[PDB]
Amino acid sequence: DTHKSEIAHRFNDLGEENFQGLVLIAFSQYLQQCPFDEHVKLVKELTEFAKTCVADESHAGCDKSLHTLFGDELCKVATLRETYGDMADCCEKQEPERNECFLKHKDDSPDLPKLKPEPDTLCAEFKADEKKFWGKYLYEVARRHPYFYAPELLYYANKYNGVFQECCQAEDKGACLLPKIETMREKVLASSARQRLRCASIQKFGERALKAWSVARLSQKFPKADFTDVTKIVTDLTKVHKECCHGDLLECADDRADLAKYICDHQDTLSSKLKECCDKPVLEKSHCIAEIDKDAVPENLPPLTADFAEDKEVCKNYQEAKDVFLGSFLYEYSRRHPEYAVSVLLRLAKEYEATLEDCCAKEDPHACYATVFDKLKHLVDEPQNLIKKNCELFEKHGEYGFQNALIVRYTRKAPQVSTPTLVEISRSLGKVGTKCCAKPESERMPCTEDYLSLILNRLCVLHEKTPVSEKVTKCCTESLVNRRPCFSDLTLDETYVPKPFDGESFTFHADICTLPDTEKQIKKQTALVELLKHKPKATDEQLKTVMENFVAFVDKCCAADDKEGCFLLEGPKLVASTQAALA
């Protein structure tokens, strides 16, 4: 809800420290290139005005919307616009427009230096000023991921500190810290992808899509809940995510706290896994609930054919009460299948929907949709063969082998996409092997579908910033829930006109010899993409030969005395070699 003084309301609800955090996150996600201390000052200033309004709401300005209050604060420190971008055009414009402009200016792949844990330096900062060091962590992560789930970011900031709380007390700082923060960094990135997809769902496919996702999601976590309760929690959660994804972070965090209290207050009718969450403080409590496993399927449930195929009122309910009727279907189908991926559950509901839209226009609707479930049961089969086929490729060729094959397959599907993007996304798609293939059946599809929906979303967010491929635009915008099988159906893009020439686009150099093995990979794989981009019908067999010429060439020259000399005298016969194998 809103109060006359929203700043007062949020500071009271949230308490200073999380108020401060979220305001830092907001500024850092709005101005991802601005320096830390210009932000800290903006936050100290908002905080003081917040305090004023708390003491006296009757004071001037206190009734201003949070947008107003944020933007005039950003616009003061930032007259800086030169090596910024176009954006200082926003400040000039007024509200509600200046805010939209801001939001529109969020950069999904800023080009900021990957940060390298320097254990001693960071431990120093912790001693001087934990608070600053807390906020330092927030600033760094928020600006690299400007849609990161803001109250979850506070949770992570606290764990990041409680880590140095523990290891900065050590003789071996590194051997302590650097395991912890690598492990935590992986979750942070996973959280970041999950949220980018939530914000893509509402932003490009409307609030309806996000709502469907949550019904499916929540029905899997609390399957013993009735559709009334699920519907109430879905409503509250959709609004939490709507606020967070629109930058309304004080309102997000506050509504999320209220929700987490409602869940915990009702835990006896929701899931017995909540016992482990519900005595925790607020942010840990919310995080634990976010992370909750599905529950077991409730026993003694009737068959879905009852309400969904047999009920005389099917077309009636679909026509008269469409969104809630599909909602009910999604809930009932989802609570019965924890072994299903959410994007799959949603795919099934869309196909159920599409069948009714065909069938209810006919003379005998029931004759037409009677068998709808046998059809949907089969849509679950499609992924299985390919998932199976890919896990076999992974077992036989490991992660590297599986990324190289994906690089060939996605370079062929989308040869216009920039080489660093094709490398990044292939490399992430290939990690699905490691993540999912040694799972059992009950988790395997959800594992794979889930993780692919997250990385394909990354591709589409990147592609929206610079659209280059017709077929990518198509799969990204056609249907959210069908993105994975769309990208799968994509074949060699015959509309692509090959890279005729350049002067030796990719050359290996003696520098390569010292890079860490990881980075030597990304160099080989870049070179693979460039090979494919110039000879877009090269065969699997030709491609494996040239990769083998890449590896033989580097091994020979990295093992040479005059390393750079070998790259320069022998480089040329790799170019000819490749030429000769491609004919």
Automatic annotation (TrEMBL):
Gene3D superfamilies the UniProt entry points to: 1.10.246.10
Binding-site residues, Zn(2+): H67, H246, D248
One Pfam entry name: Serum_albumin
Localization annotation: Secreted
Disulfide links within the chain: C53-C62, C75-C91, C90-C101, C123-C168, C167-C176, C199-C245, C244-C252, C264-C278, C277-C288, C315-C360, C359-C368, C391-C437, C436-C447, C460-C476, C475-C486, C513-C558, C557-C566
SMART domains tied to this protein: ALBUMIN
Alphabetic keyword roster: Calcium, Cleavage on pair of basic residues, Copper, Disulfide bond, Lipid-binding, Metal-binding, Methylation, Phosphoprotein, Repeat, Secreted, Signal, Zinc
Origin superkingdom: Eukaryota
Keyword Nuclease: no
Subunit: Interacts with FCGRT; this interaction regulates ALB homeostasis. Interacts with TASOR. In plasma, occurs in a covalently-linked complex with chromophore-bound alpha-1-microglobulin; this interaction does not prevent fatty acid binding to ALB.
Name of the protein this chain belongs to: Albumin
